[PDB]
Every structure is written in structure tokens, then in C-alpha cells.
RNA sequence: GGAAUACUGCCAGCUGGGACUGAGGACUGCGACGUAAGUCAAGGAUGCUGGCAUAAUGGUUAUAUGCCGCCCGUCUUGAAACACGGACCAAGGAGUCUAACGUCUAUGCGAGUGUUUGGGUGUAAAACCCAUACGCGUAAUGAAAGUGAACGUAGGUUGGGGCCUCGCAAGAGGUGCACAAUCGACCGAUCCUGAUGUCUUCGGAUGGAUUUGAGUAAGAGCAUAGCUGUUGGGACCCGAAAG
RNA sequence: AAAUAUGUAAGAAGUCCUUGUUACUUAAUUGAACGUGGACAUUUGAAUGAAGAGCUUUUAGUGGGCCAUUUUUGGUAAGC
């Protein structure tokens, strides 16, 4: 709303908050990003280091689907199981009844071992896993079988 | 004339009478503006002062943060007080039987505490239960874990999270950030 | 509405005043005012008249007589700050002034209905004048020129300085 | 001074005489009697101007 | 529970106990003040009769009145005038005379007139212009209870106990002095006695150390 | 609500100082001094009158 | 040799005249005088009396008198300026909207969040309802191939509000969220070290390093709205010589 | 070799006694650093004052200066 602005407050004051010397002008310092290696050099280096130059190797026709690999950490690993059945697998912490968790069906590409799943054996189906992620699943009695 | 040593007509710099128009929150303030005055208990002044806080100054407290605080020696059966929001954590699988007083409970947090035999109560039910904050444990969520705090105090040789929109290669990863391209920060 | 309302109203009960500590005490007249002294009236109908001071009434005023036979000034009361106390004195022994008091001089203030569009004295007030001045005129005779002194008005001549005069 | 304070406080702790370890600024001088026994005051006068060159 | 006379008598009786202590304390101070003066008066005589000279003890207390206004003051003297709480013209404060404080008074000479106050000057200042700094507020004393409630930790029970702590620089001079608000003195009634003020008292002005003549100036301003 | 001056309004003075009644009754403000007969030595007078 | 006076200083010594003020509104307090009753100048003015009851006091307005007062706006170190705009009056006349953003605040939900591309529906541009996706967040670090966050109650120490135990209290002890300093641990990069093994050239366990990251260490974000600030736009309004 | 200006310190994050750790150090349980246990509290380490102390984010205007005492350069001097 315009009625809560400072424009309604500067009515009657000559310079409208811009100063009698400053004399608010069109573009006193340039338009856009003018003078980056120049009269705006200090602001660039202090706040945006790395802005100029090139750093790496190019990639022509990069499709962001060869790199789709959302990562799931072991700390959850159980939000995938519905909460209705989640309880009774914890009490039934036995093999031959181990739940099968397809991570790809949930939309994940890799499993990372952030830590501390419970001690219930569980079947985890995934495309990729980290080395530590599997060691915790195998220690808990479960196994990791790779899918594609 | 007076040689004024300090600034004249300066406000305190602390918030009172919180700027929210929430009528139910003004009622909790009214109840604790009475308790703080007439009970001379430090608890009633901390809670009333915490009722004025803005959203960023009362960050959420997860149930895992409540459970960890009940693992302190002798705090197992203390009433947890959180002026703010109690959120839910799926990262913990066991939650103790405890009573928690908070402004709000998320649906997951309420289920976690209620399912474990505990109870979720409001701050006015705490007042009639512990008028002087008997056997209470005030908990506060993390403040500097916010995203905005990463960019406060940006400068050379600080590692202070440049305010950037797009990341990746060729986005501020160049002269000024490696010795190969000029200098490093 | 034209004006909506005052959402809170003020009470209309008058609060009692606090307990005040202004106690009345008798006035201490200046030492120059001793009954029998001759006074000069500074204001009123009879200003400039030399006149005899008889008594100190209850309402902080002075009971004063001309005498009436001498200069035509009856038994009046005057304010203590509107007179000059002179050195000349006449004895008032044998004059009974215990009768006179505040209620003796009463006006019975007229009602607002009574309007004087275009335009008497009590019988006892005339007789009371003759009783007092009879015992006071005789006391005057022992002092020569006193009757003439009381019969002549006071006035200031060119060069008379009240801050340097003695009365 | 630190180790001198501890020894002073410990030694005076046996009888408690208000040890008074704080330093003090130079206080104004007390009263005294100055005698003229062989010290009769000598009267001095300002000198007149000279050249001395 | 009527409680209109059961507890009223207890407070009224307890009040009498405090008044009795003040009455006997004030009686002893009068005997103490008079004894010291006669002893000093006699000591000067005995030394004269014995052929020697009596050198009095240097004064331990001064009353400092800021004479200069607030504009155009150099920073260092202006800082010192703030540390003596002299933030206004014609404002007074008692100072303990030590080496650490005599150098303070040397830096503000063109701005203050001070000297050695007497019992009469201190008594009339505190009785008339005595205000206590209670809860960061300037409260008129006007009663022994205000002094008792705040200065009672140091054995100061009345307004004469506080005055006794000023004329005699006691163990708790600092606490009693700082408890006093800076005195807000008026302009002198008969004038300053000089055409121009901003010269030394020695040179013919107003500022500097006027040793015992400060009492005449202060009383006119009080 | 109003500051009443001591050194006047004797009631307020008596409230602050219970000794003010004893001080006035005994005329302690005009106390006499016992007469002493000491006389300065010959050196003090000679030095005082020395040219 | 004995006094007086001056001068300076003190009195919780007495007393006369003048001026301005009367704030507050049942009581409470501290005091004073009396054996007591009670009274008082003791936490802010009352008592008596008069004239008038009306333009009398008073408000407004014009005039006169005494003293004072240079023309406003602006650029400027400095304007009444012999600096610029202004003869006068009415009406109009200049920090706005949008896209993307920073800090702060309010609100809902919360490890999630966003119904509105669209579909259903409707009292039809409203309101109400909804699937799959997708955007941002929940993981970082490398140029990349790649790899990818617990030795330990998610660590030790110093403070730390609040709470708990004793204590009449002062204080002592325990536990200590957020937050501050520090020493460690884990993840990624760099430089090393190089085990069991082997398509003998692959693999990379194990352990380090005054190296490095916009990391982890019981998640805080998403969405909408407001003031303020930034950028591109005509961009607060009017103004070139030009091309 | 001054005067005026100028750095540091005047305690609890301290002092003292005993002994624990280490891959540094020492000829050497000798050191160094950090610790455990114990003793010393409002005169706990000069004065004066403290009007609250500490910390953070964000943004405006400004970036033509001039005068006076004192020190001082150029210049005969200057309202330089």
C-alpha cells in the first residue's frame, strides 16, 4: 500500500530524502555492472571473489539427467516404510520377515551412511551405496542388493 | 545547559508487548505479566520475556532435542517448557514418557509424545500446575543454524558464504578464490 | 452517527477535599494601635478624618468613633491597614464598648428583586452614639486644641514626604 | 607485591588486625610543631634591579 | 484481625528506639566537634607560649563548584569535570583531598572555584540541598528513613550521621559522598564580588583555590 | 509532594534532628569559653615586630 | 597594667516590611505540644468581608503607543545581497508499476512446503475441491572422473540463563538449552603412506599432513504479506549539441 | 636533554602446596603446556565515575569545507 510508504512522509520537504548536495541523479556510477575491474573494484573483491575469469573444462550439451542421483542417508531409511507397518517390523526384528525397501521406487539414487539405523535386519534395494552405508546395514543383519 | 554524558531520550532496545496481533498470545502475555510481578520467581520473567520474541528468535525444538535434554542427570521427570514450536524427528526411534509445555506442537511431534505415554500441554496449563516454574526445564532451539546467518559478516579471509543465487562451476570460483587465477580471497 | 462514541466514560462523582491544616489564630495588631489613639482614615467615605480608636472587634476590624458630635463621623468599624496610628491619645476609661460587636453592625443585604430605579437610621444607633461620645467629649477638653484637631481634615501639602513624616 | 600481600595477610590472619592490603594515595600531612630553637626566622626582602654583565 | 493497633504500636515503639539512638549520637558529635576546635585553638596558643609555631594539619575535604559553563571546553578538562559529576554550571560536589585528587583539581582550575568547607556550610548544604541517589533517581532526603534505608549498611542512620561522614572524612566517605546527588546551587545572592569571574582568585577573579573564602561564596549560592 | 525546608519550619527541623531541642535549650550556639592566661614567648613577638 | 572597639567567623537567637506561588484532593507517614482527652505551622490554602451579576472581567478585531523585526525558495565555507526563479490568481504538476533479489517483521504448516499449468465444480473472472509432476529445502566437496558425514551419553575445557538439593538468609553443590572462545572427531579436495589380493597391473585397506571447503556433529525450511534497500526497465519530473 | 603528548601493569582467566598426561624437550620425572586434589573471598589488591554492560543485522545523508588560540611551511605580504 502506498499510504504506508515514506513518499507520503516526504511531502513538504524539498529533496524527498535525497539531499541538497547529492541531488539524486540518473546514473552517477554507471548502469548495471559497469566498472567491475574499476571504480567498483573494492565492492567486487570484498563481496564477490571469483567473479572474473574461467576455472574449468566445458561441457557441450549437458543433460541434467545423466547426473540424477538423489541421496538418502541411513538416518531415516525408515520413513520409506509406511508408519502403519513401521512399528511391527521393529518388534519382529528377525530374518525371513525382513522388510524390502526399494529406494529407487521412492526416488533415490544413492544411499549414504550418516548413521545409526536400529538393529533390525532389513533388505535395501538401491542403485548405488557408499562404503560406510553398507557396513552399517550388514552389521544390522540386513543386506544391500543392487538394482538398475 | 547540561554536559550530557549519555544519549538523551533513548529507548531501552528490548521488545515488550509483542507486535503480533494474536489475541490468544496477548492473553498468555497478560497471564505472565501478572505472574512475573507477583511471584518474584526467575522462571516467570524468563518465559514472559520469551513471549515477545520474533519468529527467528524462537526457533523450533525437535523431539530429539527434548529427549536428549531428558538424558541429563536428574532431569528425567522435569516439565519441558518450550516457548515456540516443537517439531517432529524421525531420526530417533525411542521417546521417553514426559510432559512438554509449548506454544505449538506439530502433528508429528504431538503423536510422538502422546504415543509414548506423555502429554502435551499449553503454557497456561503449566501456570496452574507450576506457578513458580517448579521442576521445569526451559529449552531453546538453535539460532545460528539459520541460512541467513551464513552471509552475515562477509569479508576477505573469513569463509562467510557469499550471497549467491546460482552455484556450480564458473559461479564465483575464480580469480580471488585460487592462487592460479590471481589471488585467494 | 455524527460522532461515534467515547468508548470509555469518566465518572461524575465529586471527590472530597483532603484534610487541610490551615488553622485560624488571632491577629497580632501592630503595637501603635492601642485603644484611645487618634487615627486618620486613608480611604472610604470619611478619608482624611482624624478619629478615635475604641476597640478591636472579632472580625479583625477596629471599632472607631469620631466622635460624631465633633466631626460628623459615627460609630463605625474600619480596616486596620487603612488608618494611620497617630501619637496623640485620649483616654477611653468610662466608655462601655462591650455592647458593640460584629452582629451589631449588620446590613440585611437586599434581595436582587429590590431594584433602586431612582432612589432611615436605626433609633438605637443614634442613641448609642450619644452615650459613647458624651463620656469621650469630656475627656477631650482636658487636652487643649484637641477638639479643633479632630474637627479638621488631614491632607498632604506640597513638600510633605510620608516616608519622613511622623504622625 | 603479590607474594608480599599473601605473606602479610597470612601472618596477620592469626590475630585479625584489618590487614588493609590496598595501596593508598599520598595523604595530606598531619599537624606538627616547628620550633625556633636555633632556627630563628630569617627575614628576606626582594632585591633591586642590577645589570650583572 | 483488626491489626490497626496491634502492629501500629509495635512500629510506633520501634520508632522511639531509633530516635533515641539519633539523639545520643548527635549529642556525642556536638561534644566531638567542640572538643576538636578547642584543642586546635589551645594548641596554637601553647606553641606560641613555648616559642614554637603550630603547623596545622592540611585540609582533608574540599567543596568544588563548577563556575564555567559547558561550551568550548577542551576534552581532558571536560572529561575530568564529568568524573567529578560537575556537569552543570553552579553545581557542587565534595572531594576527598589526596594526591590522586589534587591533580584532578589542577586540570579544572579555570572552570571551578573550590576551597575548604566548614561545618556550617556542609550542614546548611545537606539540610537544604541534600538529595539522595536512590535507585538511580534523585530523591529529596527530608527524613531519616531514606538515609537509613540506603546508607544504613555503613552505620549511617540519620542526616547528622551523613553530615558527620562529610566533615570528618571517614572510612565510608566514598559511599556517602556518591550517595549524595551533586548539589544544584543558585547564583550568589550578593553577586560574585568581582567584575570578571574567569581569572584566578589570586589574580582577582573567581576560579582556583579560595581556601576558606569558599564558605562565603557557597552560602550566598545556597 | 512538597519539599519543606529545614533551617526554617522548625517542625521539619525537629523531625530530622531530635537534638535540635537540646541544642536550643542549652544555648549551645553561644557557648562561653573558659578564660586562659597563656602569653606568647619573647621570640614570637620579637619576630612578629621584626623589621 | 586593665579594658573597650574594629575586623573576620558561628548561633538547631529573636523580630519588622515587600514580592511571586496555592500544584494535590476521604484516611494511612514521619514529627511536635499535653498525665490523659486532644491539638498543631507535622506527606501542597484556608477563614471572614465587600462590590458586581453585567460586555464589568474576558476573547476577537482595527487603531495608537514602547521596543524589536531585511525577501522567500536555492546552489554555497559564506545570501537581505549589486547571485539566480518569482507581476498576480485558479486548476494541473514530479520516488510510480513490474521481473528477480538482501535484511527485518507478521502469518500458516513444518522435514517438509507451495490448491489456482491444469482438472472437478459453481449462486460463473468469485467461492469451494483435487491427481501426477515440478520448484525450493532435507549433503557436501572437487576442473572433472569420483567419493560422500557418530571412537566417544554426537566429544573435552572455560563461561552461561533457568531449574534442582541444603541453607532463615547470605551462599555452597548438581544439571546446565540458546550463545561466546578453544582443543579434538567425521565428510569432500590436495600432498603423502601403500596391506590382504591379482587378468602383474589393477585394487586401495591402514595411518599422517603449519594444506583446503560457501561441510557434519538429534535438521529449518517452504509459502504469502508489509516497510526499507538493489538491479533492468521511461524509472522522481522537465532539459541537449547530436545519430 | 625537558614540558606537553605516549605503551604496559595494579589479581579469581589470581597466588601458593602436592602430583597426572605427552609422540615436544632434557644427560636425567629435568623442563614446557594443560590438568586433578588442597589452602587463601568483599579492603579481593590504588583514586574518581559508571547515566546499564556486551553483541548483531541493515540502511540514509556525506565524501567542495571554512574560522579562532596555540605549533608551523612557502611567500615582502595578503580577508594568500
Task: Give yes or no for a contact between E213 and E192, defined as CB atoms under 8 angstroms apart.
Answer: no
Q: Is the CB of A19 under 7 A from strand H?
A: yes
Task: Give yes or no for a contact between B22 and B30, defined as CB atoms under 8 angstroms apart.
Answer: no
Host H or E run for residue C88? strand C83-89
Taken in order E14, E17, E21, E27, is the CA torsion positive or negative?
Answer: positive
Strand partners, B138: B81
Residue F11 makes CB contacts below 8 A (sequence gap 6+) with: none
C79 CB neighbour count, 10 Å cutoff: 13
Q: Which of residues 19-48 of F touch strand G (CB under 7 A)?
A: 19-21, 23-24, 27-30
The angstrom resolution of this structure is: 3.5
For residues C58 and C128, give the distance between their C-alpha atoms in angstroms, rounded to a whole number.
20
Q: Is the CB of E131 under 7 A from strand H?
A: no
For residues C33 and C39, give the distance between their C-alpha atoms in angstroms, rounded to a whole number.
9
- Residue F12 CA, chain-centre distance (Å), reads 22
- Residue C71's φ and ψ, nearest 5 degrees, are -125, 15
Q: CA at E137, C1' at H51: how many angstroms apart?
A: 11
Residues of E at the F interface, defined by Cβ within 8 angstroms: 19, 22-23, 26-27, 30, 34, 38, 42, 45-46, 48-51, 124, 127-128, 140, 142-144, 158-160
Q: Do D43 and F43 touch (CB under 8 A)?
A: no
For residues B182 and A49, give the distance between their C-alpha atoms in angstroms, rounded to a whole number.
11
Which string of b and e fits C127-141 if b means at least 16 CB within 10 Å? ebbeebbeebbebbe
Cα–Cα distance list, A81 to A99, A100, B102, C107 (Å):
8, 9, 30, 112
Burial of F14 (0-12, 13-18, 19+ CB in 10 A): middle
Question: Nearest CA to F9 among F25, F23, F20?
Answer: F20
Residues of E at the B interface, defined by Cβ within 8 angstroms: 69-71, 73, 78, 81-82, 87-89
Nucleotides on strand H lying under 7 Å from protein C-beta: 5, 10-11, 14-16, 40-41, 43-54, 56-58, 60-64
Choose the closest CB to B2 out of E73, E78, E87.
E87
Nucleotide nearest to B139 (CA to C1'): G177
Cell numbers for B34: 501478572
Nucleotide nearest to B6 (CA to C1'): H51
Residue B24 makes CB contacts below 8 A (sequence gap 6+) with: none
Cis omega (within 30 of 0) on the bond before C73?
no
A104 CB neighbour count, 10 Å cutoff: 12
Choose the closest CB to B93 out of A46, A48, A118.
A118
- Collapse the DSSP code of A148 into the 3-class scheme (helix H, G, I; strand E, B; otherwise coil) and give the result: coil
Strand partners, E140: E131
Q: Is the CB of F2 under 7 A from strand G?
A: yes
- Collapse the DSSP code of E208 into the 3-class scheme (helix H, G, I; strand E, B; otherwise coil) and give the result: strand
Q: Is the CB of B155 under 7 A from strand H?
A: no
Provide the terminal-to-terminal Cα distance of chain B, rounded to the nearest Å: 52
Q: Is the CB of E105 under 7 A from strand H?
A: no
Task: Give yes or no for a contact between A101 and A79, defined as CB atoms under 8 angstroms apart.
Answer: no
Q: Which of residues 15-44 of D touch strand H (CB under 7 A)?
A: 18-25
For residues B184 and A96, give the distance between their C-alpha atoms in angstroms, rounded to a whole number.
58
Amino acid at each position: 500500500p502506498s499510504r504506508f510508504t515514506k513518499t507520503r512522509k516526504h511531502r513538504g520537504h524539498v529533496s524527498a530524502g535525497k539531499g541538497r548536495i547529492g541531488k539524486h541523479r540518473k546514473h552517477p556510477g554507471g548502469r548495471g555492472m559497469a566498472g567491475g575491474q574499476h571504480h567498483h573494484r573494492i565492492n567486487m573483491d570484498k563481496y564477490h571473489p571469483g567473479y572474473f575469469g574461467k576455472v574449468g573444462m566445458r561441457y557441450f550439451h549437458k543433460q541434467q539427467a545423466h547426473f540424477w542421483k538423489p541421496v538418502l542417508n541411513l538416518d531415516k531409511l525408515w520413513t520409506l516404510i509406511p508408519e502403519d507397518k513401521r512399528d511391527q517390523y521393529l518388534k519382529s526384528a528377525s530374518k525371513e520377515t525382513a522388510p524390502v525397501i526399494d529406494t529407487l521406487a521412492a526416488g533415490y539414487g544413492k544411499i549414504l551412511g550418516k548413521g545409526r539405523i536400529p538393529n533390525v535386519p532389513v533388505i535395501v534395494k538401491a542403485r548405488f551405496v557408499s562404503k560406510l552405508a553398507e557396513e552399517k546395514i550388514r552389521a544390522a543383519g540386513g543386506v544391500v542388493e543392487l538394482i538398475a | 545547559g547540561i554536559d550530557h554524558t549519555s544519549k538523551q531520550h533513548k529507548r531501552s532496545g528490548h521488545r515488550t508487548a509483542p507486535k503480533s496481533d494474536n489475541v490468544y498470545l496477548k492473553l498468555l502475555v497478560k497471564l505472565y505479566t501478572f505472574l512475573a510481578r507477583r511471584t518474584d520467581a526467575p522462571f516467570n520473567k524468563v518465559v514472559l520475556k520469551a513471549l515477545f520474541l520474533s519468529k527467528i528468535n524462537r526457533p523450533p525444538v525437535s523431539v530429539s532435542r527434548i529427549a536428549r535434554a531428558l538424558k541429563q542427570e536428574g532431569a528425567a521427570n522435569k516439565t519441558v517448557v518450550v516457548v515456540g514450536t516443537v517439531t517432529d524427528d524421525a531420526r530417533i526411534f525411542e521417546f521417553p514418557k514426559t510432559t512438554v509445555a509449548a506454544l505449538r506442537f506439530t502433528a508429528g511431534a504431538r503423536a510422538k509424545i502422546v504415543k509414548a505415554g506423555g502429554e502435551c500441554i499449553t503454557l497456561d496449563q503449566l501456570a496452574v500446575r507450576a506457578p513458580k516454574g517448579q521442576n521445569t526445564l526451559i529449552l531453546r532451539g538453535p539460532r545460528n543454524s539459520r541460512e541467513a546467518v551464513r552471509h552475515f559478516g562477509m569479508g576477505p579471509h573469513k569463509g562467510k558464504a557469499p550471497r549467491i543465487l546460482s552455484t556450480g562451476r564458473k559461479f564465483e570460483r575464480a580469480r580471488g578464490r585460487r592462487r592460479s587465477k590471481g589471488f585467494k580471497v | 452517527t455524527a460522532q461515534q462514541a467515547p468508548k470509555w466514560y469518566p465518572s461524575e462523582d465529586v471527590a472530597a477535599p483532603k484534610k487541610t491544616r490551615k488553622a485560624v489564630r488571632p491577629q497580632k495588631l501592630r503595637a501603635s494601635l492601642v485603644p484611645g489613639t487618634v487615627l486618620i482614615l486613608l480611604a472610604g467615605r470619611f478619608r482624611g478624618k482624624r478619629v478615635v480608636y475604641l476597640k478591636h472587634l472579632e472580625d479583625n476590624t477596629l471599632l472607631v468613633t469620631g466622635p460624631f458630635k465633633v466631626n460628623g463621623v459615627p460609630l463605625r468599624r474600619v480596616n486596620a491597614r487603612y488608618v494611620i496610628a497617630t501619637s496623640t491619645k485620649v483616654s477611653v476609661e468610662g466608655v462601655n464598648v462591650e455592647k458593640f460587636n460584629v452582629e451589631y453592625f449588620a446590613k440585611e443585604k437586599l434581595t436582587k428583586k429590590e431594584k433602586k430605579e431612582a432612589n432611615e437610621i436605626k433609633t438605637e444607633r443614634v442613641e448609642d452614639q450619644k452615650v459613647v461620645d458624651k463620656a469621650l467629649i469630656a475627656e477631650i477638653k482636658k487636652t487643649p486644641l484637641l477638639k479643633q484637631y479632630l474637627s479638621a481634615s488631614f491632607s498632604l501639602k506640597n513638600g510633605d514626604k510620608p516616608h519622613m513624616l511622623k504622625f | 607485591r603479590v607474594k608480599a600481600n599473601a605473606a602479610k595477610r597470612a601472618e596477620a590472619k592469626a590475630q585479625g588486625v584489618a590487614v588493609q592490603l590496598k595501596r593508598q594515595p599520598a595523604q595530606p600531612r598531619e599537624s606538627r610543631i616547628v620550633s625556633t630553637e636555633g632556627n630563628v626566622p630569617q627575614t628576606l626582602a626582594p632585591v633591586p634591579y642590577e645589570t650583572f654583565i | 484481625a483488626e491489626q490497626v493497633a496491634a502492629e501500629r504500636a509495635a512500629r510506633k515503639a520501634a520508632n522511639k528506639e531509633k530516635r533515641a539512638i539519633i539523639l545520643e549520637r548527635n549529642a556525642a558529635y556536638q561534644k566531638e566537634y567542640e572538643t576538636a576546635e578547642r584543642n586546635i585553638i589551645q594548641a596554637k596558643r601553647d606553641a606560641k607560649a613555648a616559642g614554637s609555631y603550630y603547623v596545622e594539619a592540611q585540609h582533608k575535604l574540599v567543596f568544588v563548584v563548577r563556575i564555567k559553563g559547558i561550551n568550548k571546553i577542551p576534552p581532558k578538562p571536560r572529561k575530568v569535570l564529568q568524573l567529578l559529576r560537575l556537569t552543570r554550571i553552579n553545581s557542587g560536589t565534595f572531594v576527598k583531598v589526596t594526591k590522586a585528587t589534587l591533580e584532578l583539581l589542577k586540570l579544572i582550575e579555570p572552570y571551578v572555584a573550590y576551597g575548604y568547607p566548614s561545618y556550617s556550610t556542609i550542614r546548611q548544604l545537606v539540610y537544604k540541598r541534600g538529595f539522595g541517589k536512590i535507585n538511580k533517581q534523585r530523591v529529596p532526603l527530608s527524613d531519616n528513613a531514606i538515609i537509613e534505608a540506603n546508607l544504613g549498611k555503613y552505620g549511617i542512620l540519620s542526616i547528622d550521621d551523613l553530615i558527620h561522614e562529610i566533615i570528618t572524612v571517614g572510612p565510608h566517605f566514598k559511599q556517602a559522598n556518591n550517595f549524595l546527588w551533586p548539589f544544584k546551587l543558585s547564583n550568589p545572592s550578593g553577586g560574585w564580588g568581582v567584575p570578571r569571574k574567569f581569572k584566578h582568585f589570586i589574580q582577582g577573579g573567581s576560579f582556583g583555590n579560595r581556601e576558606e573564602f569558599i564558605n562565603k561564596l557557597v552560602k550566598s549560592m545556597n | 509532594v512538597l519539599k519543606k525546608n529545614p533551617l526554617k519550619n522548625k517542625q521539619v527541623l525537629l523531625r530530622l534532628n531530635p537534638y535540635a531541642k537540646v541544642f536550643a535549650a542549652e544555648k549551645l550556639g553561644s557557648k562561653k569559653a573558659e578564660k586562659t592566661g597563656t602569653k606568647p614567648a619573647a621570640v614570637f613577638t620579637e619576630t612578629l615586630k621584626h623589621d
